[PDB]
Design an enzyme around this catalytic site. Structure first.
Site, PDB file in Angstrom:
ATOM      1  CE  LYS A  92      -4.260  -1.712   1.743  1.00  0.00           C
ATOM      2  NZ  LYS A  92      -4.907  -2.389   2.890  1.00  0.00           N
TER       3      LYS A  92
ATOM      4  NE  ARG B 287      -6.882  -9.075   1.631  1.00  0.00           N
ATOM      5  CZ  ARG B 287      -6.595  -8.300   0.605  1.00  0.00           C
ATOM      6  NH1 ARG B 287      -5.703  -7.326   0.706  1.00  0.00           N
ATOM      7  NH2 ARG B 287      -7.204  -8.571  -0.533  1.00  0.00           N
TER       8      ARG B 287
HETATM    9  N1  2PH Z   1      -9.849  -7.420   5.668  1.00  0.00           N
HETATM   10  C1  2PH Z   1      -9.266  -6.689   4.671  1.00  0.00           C
HETATM   11  N2  2PH Z   1      -9.544  -6.946   3.394  1.00  0.00           N
HETATM   12  C2  2PH Z   1      -8.953  -6.183   2.428  1.00  0.00           C
HETATM   13  C3  2PH Z   1      -7.987  -5.164   2.794  1.00  0.00           C
HETATM   14  C4  2PH Z   1      -7.730  -4.878   4.119  1.00  0.00           C
HETATM   15  O1  2PH Z   1      -7.042  -3.908   4.463  1.00  0.00           O
HETATM   16  N3  2PH Z   1      -8.350  -5.691   5.054  1.00  0.00           N
HETATM   17  N4  2PH Z   1      -7.359  -4.414   1.823  1.00  0.00           N
HETATM   18  C5  2PH Z   1      -7.658  -4.533   0.555  1.00  0.00           C
HETATM   19  C6  2PH Z   1      -6.905  -3.748  -0.422  1.00  0.00           C
HETATM   20  O2  2PH Z   1      -7.558  -3.917  -1.689  1.00  0.00           O
HETATM   21  P1  2PH Z   1      -6.869  -3.549  -3.065  1.00  0.00           P
HETATM   22  O3  2PH Z   1      -7.934  -3.682  -4.121  1.00  0.00           O
HETATM   23  O4  2PH Z   1      -6.143  -2.273  -2.834  1.00  0.00           O
HETATM   24  O5  2PH Z   1      -5.847  -4.721  -3.237  1.00  0.00           O
HETATM   25  P2  2PH Z   1      -5.058  -5.982  -2.892  1.00  0.00           P
HETATM   26  O6  2PH Z   1      -6.022  -7.179  -2.923  1.00  0.00           O
HETATM   27  O7  2PH Z   1      -4.061  -6.311  -3.919  1.00  0.00           O
HETATM   28  O8  2PH Z   1      -4.454  -5.945  -1.538  1.00  0.00           O
HETATM   29  C7  2PH Z   1      -8.696  -5.425   0.013  1.00  0.00           C
HETATM   30  N5  2PH Z   1      -9.278  -6.239   1.045  1.00  0.00           N
END
Ligand code: 2PH
Length: 282
Positions: free
Chosen positions: A221, A255
């Site tokens: 991020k 995660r």
């Molecule tokens: N519980 C939880 N779930 C999540 C979280 C998070 O912080 N906590 N962050 C995310 C970020 O989503 P993005 O679409 O930015 O991408 P990524 O799947 O590649 O991490 C997507 N889903």
């Protein structure tokens, strides 16, 4: 602590690494669901073999300006990947959906945790989670993730994330989901600016007063990117530092995208918190 789902338990005495498997339209190819099904199923296998204990399968992207996905597009992608994984392997599966239909169907094919970043706020979501009966993750978000809007002003971000959890757990208990099945997540990167994110990271030890499991998502991020000024390929060292800080303070699930190196980091943290008198840093 222990989560129980689908006839199995998850033991949260040590931190679990949750691998990410995004199965969007623009990645789970062409038209309406390809032989991308073998890739999905192969990707899960490498992560499981890298040491992942939960895989988070999701069909939406939530980055800024991300396209909306319809229920058909989610049900075509997410559900056959969820079913294939639960047949083939003994991992735990979280579904990162917001749609009621996709919650009800993931339940039937074997998913274990509903990990809705919208915290069941869509029409019909809370009761679909409720009839399912599975662990639900609640996440702080301010504003809509997929906009190109700058960040809120918080009088205080910790106090606001904390009031949000108080409110949300109650909402759930009233829907008939016992406080026993919730996980809480501060929402790193959702409606927060760089300082708000590091203040929430700095004090993560303190959300333990709820006595619920803590889930944290900080992999690649902008809180790492802007701080270091590198691009999305160049954020592993900063993403591992966020995972160690977070697990030192007792977070239960991290995660990540980079499962092998995070699992390897979690092992050194284990080694350390086991020699540490109160098993947590604060
Ligand atoms: N519980 C939880 N779930 C999540 C979280 C998070 O912080 N906590 N962050 C995310 C970020 O989503 P993005 O679409 O930015 O991408 P990524 O799947 O590649 O991490 C997507 N889903």
């Amino acid at each position: 602590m222990k989560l129980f789902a689908q006839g199995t338990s998850l033991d949260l005495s040590h931190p679990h690494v949750m691998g990410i498997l995004n199965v969007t339209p623009d990645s789970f190819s062409d038209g309406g669901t390809h032989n991308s099904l073998i890739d999905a199923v192969k990707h899960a296998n490498l992560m499981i073999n890298a040491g992942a204990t939960i895989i988070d399968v999701g069909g939406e992207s939530t980055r800024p300006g991300a396209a909306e996905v319809s229920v058909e597009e989610e049900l075509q992608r997410v559900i056959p990947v969820v079913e294939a994984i639960a047949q083939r392997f003994e991992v735990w599966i979280s579904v990162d959906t917001s749609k009621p239909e996709v919650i009800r169907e993931s339940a039937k094919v074997g998913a274990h945790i509903i990990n809705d970043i919208r915290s069941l706020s869509e029409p019909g979501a809370l009761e679909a989670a409720a009839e399912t009966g599975l662990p639900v993750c609640l996440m702080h978000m301010q504003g809509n993730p997929k906009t190109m809007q700058e960040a809120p002003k918080y009088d205080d971000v910790f106090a606001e994330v904390n009031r949000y959890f108080i409110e949300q757990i109650a909402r759930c208990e009233q829907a008939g989901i016992a406080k026993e099945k919730l996980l809480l997540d501060p929402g790193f990167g959702f409606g927060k600016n760089l300082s708000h994110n590091y203040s929430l990271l700095a004090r993560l030890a303190e959300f333990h007063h709820f006595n619920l499991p803590l889930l944290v998502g900080m992999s690649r991020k902008s809180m790492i990117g802007q701080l270091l000024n590198v691009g999305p390929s160049e954020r592993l060292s900063g993403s591992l530092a966020c995972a160690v800080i977070a697990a030192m303070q007792g977070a239960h699930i991290i995660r990540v995208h980079d499962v092998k190196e995070t699992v390897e980091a979690m092992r050194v943290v284990e080694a350390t918190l086991s020699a540490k008198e109160n098993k947590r840093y604060e």
